[PDB]
Amino acid sequence: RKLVEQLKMEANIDRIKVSKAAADLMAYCEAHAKEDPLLTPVPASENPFR
Amino acid sequence: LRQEAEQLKNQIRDARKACADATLSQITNNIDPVGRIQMRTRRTLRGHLAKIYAMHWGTDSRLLVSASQDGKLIIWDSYTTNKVHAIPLRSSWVMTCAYAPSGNYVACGGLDNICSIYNLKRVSRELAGHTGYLSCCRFLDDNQIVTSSGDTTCALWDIETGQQTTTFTGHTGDVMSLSLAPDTRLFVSGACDASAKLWDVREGMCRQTFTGHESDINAICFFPNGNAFATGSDDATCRLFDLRADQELMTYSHDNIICGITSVSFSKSGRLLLAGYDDFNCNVWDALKADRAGVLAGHDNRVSCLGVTDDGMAVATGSWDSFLKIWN
Amino acid sequence: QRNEEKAQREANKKIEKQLQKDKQVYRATHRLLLLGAGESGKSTIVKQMRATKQDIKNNLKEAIETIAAMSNLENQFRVDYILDEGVRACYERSNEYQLIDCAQYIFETKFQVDKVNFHMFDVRDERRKWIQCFNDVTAIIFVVASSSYNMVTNRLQEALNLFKSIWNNRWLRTISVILFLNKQDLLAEKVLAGKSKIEDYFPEFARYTTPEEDPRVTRAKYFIRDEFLRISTASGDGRHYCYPHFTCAVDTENIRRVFNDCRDIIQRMHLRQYELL
Amino acid sequence: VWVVGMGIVMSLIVLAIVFGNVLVITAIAKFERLQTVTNYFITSLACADLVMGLAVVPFGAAHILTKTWTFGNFWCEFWTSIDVLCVTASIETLCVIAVDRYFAITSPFKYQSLLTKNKARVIILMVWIVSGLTSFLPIQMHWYRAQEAINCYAEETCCDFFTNQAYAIASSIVSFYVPLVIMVFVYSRVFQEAKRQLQKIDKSEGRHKALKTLGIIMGTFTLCWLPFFIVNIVHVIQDNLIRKEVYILLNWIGYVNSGFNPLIYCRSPDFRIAFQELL
Numbered sequence: 051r052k053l054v055e056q057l058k059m060e061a062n063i064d065r066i067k068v069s070k071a072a073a074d075l076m077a078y079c080e081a082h083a084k085e086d087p088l089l090t091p092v093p094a095s096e097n098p099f100r
Numbered sequence: 101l102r103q104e105a106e107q108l109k110n111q112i113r114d115a116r117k118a119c120a121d122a123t124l125s126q127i128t129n130n131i132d133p134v135g136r137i138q139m140r141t142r143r144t145l146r147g148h149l150a151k152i153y154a155m156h157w158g159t160d161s162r163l164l165v166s167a168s169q170d171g172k173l174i175i176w177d178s179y180t181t182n183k184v185h186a187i188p189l190r191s192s193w194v195m196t197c198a199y200a201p202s203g204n205y206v207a208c209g210g211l212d213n214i215c216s217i218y219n220l221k222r223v224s225r226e227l228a229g230h231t232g233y234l235s236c237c238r239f240l241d242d243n244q245i246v247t248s249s250g251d252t253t254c255a256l257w258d259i260e261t262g263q264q265t266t267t268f269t270g271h272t273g274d275v276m277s278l279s280l281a282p283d284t285r286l287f288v289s290g291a292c293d294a295s296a297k298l299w300d301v302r303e304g305m306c307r308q309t310f311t312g313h314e315s316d317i318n319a320i321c322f323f324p325n326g327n328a329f330a331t332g333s334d335d336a337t338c339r340l341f342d343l344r345a346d347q348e349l350m351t352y353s354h355d356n357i358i359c360g361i362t363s364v365s366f367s368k369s370g371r372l373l374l375a376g377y378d379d380f381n382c383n384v385w386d387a388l389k390a391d392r393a394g395v396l397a398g399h400d401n402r403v404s405c406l407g408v409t410d411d412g413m414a415v416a417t418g419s420w421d422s423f424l425k426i427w428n
Numbered sequence: 429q430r431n432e433e434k435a436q437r438e439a440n441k442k443i444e445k446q447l448q449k450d451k452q453v454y455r456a457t458h459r460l461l462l463l464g465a466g467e468s469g470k471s472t473i474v475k476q477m478r479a480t481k482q483d484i485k486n487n488l489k490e491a492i493e494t495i496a497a498m499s500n501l502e503n504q505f506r507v508d509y510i511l512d513e514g515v516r517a518c519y520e521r522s523n524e525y526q527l528i529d530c531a532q533y534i535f536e537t538k539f540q541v542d543k544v545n546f547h548m549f550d551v552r553d554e555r556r557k558w559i560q561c562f563n564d565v566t567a568i569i570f571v572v573a574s575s576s577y578n579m580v581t582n583r584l585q586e587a588l589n590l591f592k593s594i595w596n597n598r599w600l601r602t603i604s605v606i607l608f609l610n611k612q613d614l615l616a617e618k619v620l621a622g623k624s625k626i627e628d629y630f631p632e633f634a635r636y637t638t639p640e641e642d643p644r645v646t647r648a649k650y651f652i653r654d655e656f657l658r659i660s661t662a663s664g665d666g667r668h669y670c671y672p673h674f675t676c677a678v679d680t681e682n683i684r685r686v687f688n689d690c691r692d693i694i695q696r697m698h699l700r701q702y703e704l705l
Numbered sequence: 706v707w708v709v710g711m712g713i714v715m716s717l718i719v720l721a722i723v724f725g726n727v728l729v730i731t732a733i734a735k736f737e738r739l740q741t742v743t744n745y746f747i748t749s750l751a752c753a754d755l756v757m758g759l760a761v762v763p764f765g766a767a768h769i770l771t772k773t774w775t776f777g778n779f780w781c782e783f784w785t786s787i788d789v790l791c792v793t794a795s796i797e798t799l800c801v802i803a804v805d806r807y808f809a810i811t812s813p814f815k816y817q818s819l820l821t822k823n824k825a826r827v828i829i830l831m832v833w834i835v836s837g838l839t840s841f842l843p844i845q846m847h848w849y850r851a852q853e854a855i856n857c858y859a860e861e862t863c864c865d866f867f868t869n870q871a872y873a874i875a876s877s878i879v880s881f882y883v884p885l886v887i888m889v890f891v892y893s894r895v896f897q898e899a900k901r902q903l904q905k906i907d908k909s910e911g912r913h914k915a916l917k918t919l920g921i922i923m924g925t926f927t928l929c930w931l932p933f934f935i936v937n938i939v940h941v942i943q944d945n946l947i948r949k950e951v952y953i954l955l956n957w958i959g960y961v962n963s964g965f966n967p968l969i970y971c972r973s974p975d976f977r978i979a980f981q982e983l984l
């Protein structure tokens with residue numbers, strides 16, 4: 051019986067367009083990609099490991 | 101009777117299909133590929149008794165904690181490659197591990213249906229309200245600890261109180277992995293019944309519940325933006341869901357890939373998704389381009405866990421061969 | 429300044445020294461898993477291998493609660509207070525209705541080391557994903573109730589279905605299985621007396637015959653093993669061996685029986701390596 | 706031109722012994738998985754084979770093919786000492802590995818406990834150390850020296866060895882004869898254990914290859930050294946019996962055993978795993 055209530059809870063949800071969500075996530079992956087050592091390895095001196 | 105819930109299920113599915121306007125791959129096609137990525141073991145971390153099941157980066161990123169089936173829990177200093185503290189676990193078998201954002205306490209799970217938090221600076225408390233084995237433990241602060249168990253009920257304990265403050269229950273299958281978001285408000289938990297639902301710590305109600313996969317869900321992790329997360333099924337396919345869209349954004353799967361998935365973790369920028377397997381290799385795929393970029397297979401046995409530091413400097417990966425390789 | 433690195437070295441040396449000491453202990457210890465079906469009585473052989481009183485009353489109260497027997501089908505007022513002639517019918521109906529406690533009346537263990545230290549322990553989940561976490565156990569004691577055909581798909585068939593789950597898992601691709609036909613005397617007891625023949629539960633029983641106590645029980649005794657052997661026969665290819673020796677109600681040698689079977693478990697494992705045999 | 710053609714075959718033998726043992730030795734350190742428990746002895750045998758192959762074998766080809774031992778007299782004696790240890794190591798290492806298989810199967814539940822990584826180094830070093838007492842005499846001491854071709858020791862041209870009858874009997878025993886008793890006895894008891902297991906499984910299940918599998922391990926070792934060491938003891942007691950050319954032919958028969966050693970030693974998926982990265 052709770053599932054009917056649970057489904058009713060999720061029946062009305064504010065939904066964002068998948069195209070809009072994709073673009074925002076793409077920008078979040080675009081503007082924030084600069085500070086990513088995995089994307090571009092830094093100097094062995096800068097990297098504590100190497 | 102139950103048809104209304106089935107009608108509601110059809111109504112929910114209709115909204116998601118209607119909300120779908122364009123495909124992620126179509127939008128991400130113009131995005132330039134990351135290219136081939138080669139990783140090496142800048143450190144070769146090893147020296148444990150038996151096969152390990154968990155690994156978790158510290159908040160300061162200097163230390164990592166790994167727990168093995170041998171019952172020995174040891175916190176390992178990545179830079180010096182020298183073990184810092186080795187604390188034995190009362191339970192013979194452990195299934196999960198966690199590290200404090202403050203770094204004061206280290207939490208180790210257990211298959212003995214009891215969760216215990218250890219004090220680095222002497223076990224502090226033992227929690228056993230949940231039934232069955234504990235799947236994943238992770239606590240945002242030194243007061244609230246989130247553990248997902250095999251009783252299909254994940255609850256957030258109070259470290260000071262030692263009792264279940266709230267209970268997030270009603271999940272179909274056994275919960276196998278729990279992931280916390282940087283916002284610390286909402287957390288997504290994955291169960292063995294292919295259902296991936298995101299809870300709210302204060303509300304205690306499943307705001308969204310996704311069931312895109314067919315097989316059991318193995319692990320889940322959030323993106324840095326905290327608006328989406330990725331999960332890996334027991335089937336070869338792993339998918340990423342956009343919370344605001346409540347749908348499966350992109351399906352990640354290679355025809356050659358047929359083995360199981362045991363871990364999942366994004367990068368600091370989130371572009372590079374590193375996915376472990378039972379095929380002794382970890383594959384790093386582009387989150388936006390939805391294509392495989394590079395593979396690494398340093399481990400010899402099945403990879404158990406994988407994580408990325410808060411700073412994002414380098415990735416770690418577990419292994420059932422007792423050798424955890426710190427890739428960079 | 430640099431003393432910090434030296435200090436960590438001493439701690440690392442101390443940790444490594446302590447870990448090295450425990451390495452011999454862990455390798456010496458042999459780990460077993462007791463995967464037993466419900467009502468099979470795995471605890472009985474576990475007790476035999478190894479203020480209480482209100483323990484007897486709790487089982488009696490649990491049996492009285494099941495003696496729920498009226499729901500399955502004067503004293504009713506007496507039954508209401510607790511919640512005989514009805515007991516005999518309930519005992520007869522106990523074949524269908526589950527009665528864990530005997531009408532007559534992560535747990536661990538440290539088995540006697542003897543030659544080599546052995547610490548056995550057990551772990552009700554339908555998914556049973558916990559099994560896949562175990563791949564280093566030398567062998568798994570799989571206690572099965574022989575007199576399960578009368579109970580309940582029959583209970584024995586459900587127990588036989590465990591092998592399909594156990595062996596097709598492929599996670600335990602190098603772990604042998606030891607099974608005890610528990611309640612062997614009880615299995616013959618129902619078999620020896622006139623009752624519902626196993627042919628009614630297992631249709632192919634009549635076609636089966638004894639391989640090369642009364643023969644009625646003796647023929648029945650082998651058939652359950654043969655059915656269990658047939659599943660274990662296919663897809664073995666070494667490293668997966670079933671040691672099906674029976675187990676009576678009381679047999680103190682059962683602990684010694686495992687050790688003899690345990691030696692063959694390790695020896696066959698080594699012979700698999702180097703392709704010697 | 707017969708020597709030139711013969712040298713071509715001899716050239717391959719030196720090359721074969723080089724890569725044959727090195728590849729197994731390279732895999733032992735390249736992959737950490739196989740490095741720890743076993744093949745640690747097999748590396749010592751491989752290391753012993755490399756010394757016999759890369760150093761002792763080619764100079765022998767130079768000795769026979771060329772007019773004489775053009776090199777110095779001191780290195781001529783040095784070659785015999787280095788050759789003695791390498792041949793003594795491979796036989797001993799095979800016996801040590803032979804004990805490894807027997808001591809595990811015949812006494813389980815204690816093999817894992819008793820054997821240790823430090824204990825493996827002690828036994829492996831003891832094989833080399835025991836080889837030291839076999840190689841100490843020819844170089845440091847002069848008890849090796851023989852009037853039959855006595856000038857050969859003095860001459861710088863011919864480096865052929867003539868040894869005292871006392872040394873030949875004792876050295877041959879410590880090298881091949883004694884481990885033969887250990888290798889055969891240990892493996893014979895093993896064959897009983899495998900036979901017992903097969904019979905037990907036959908009774909357990911209503912529905913041998915071991916003899917062939919254990920045959921190659923003992924057969925190859927016997928068929929490559931027995932004709933040599935039989936001849937070695939023969940000439941020391943009966944000098945007129947042996948033919949000089951016959952001694953050299955059997956001498957190079959036993960050197961091929963180190964080249965064919967890896968096939969008996971490491972032929973399994975782990976060895977096949979080694980070829981995986983090198984392909």
Ligand SMILES: CN[C@@H]1CCc2c(ccc(O)c2O)[C@H]1O
Nearest residue numbers: 785788789792793876877880956
């Ligand atoms: C060319 N003949 C060599 C030198 C003498 C010698 C050999 C093998 C084993 C021994 O114990 C020896 O003393 C032969 O490999």
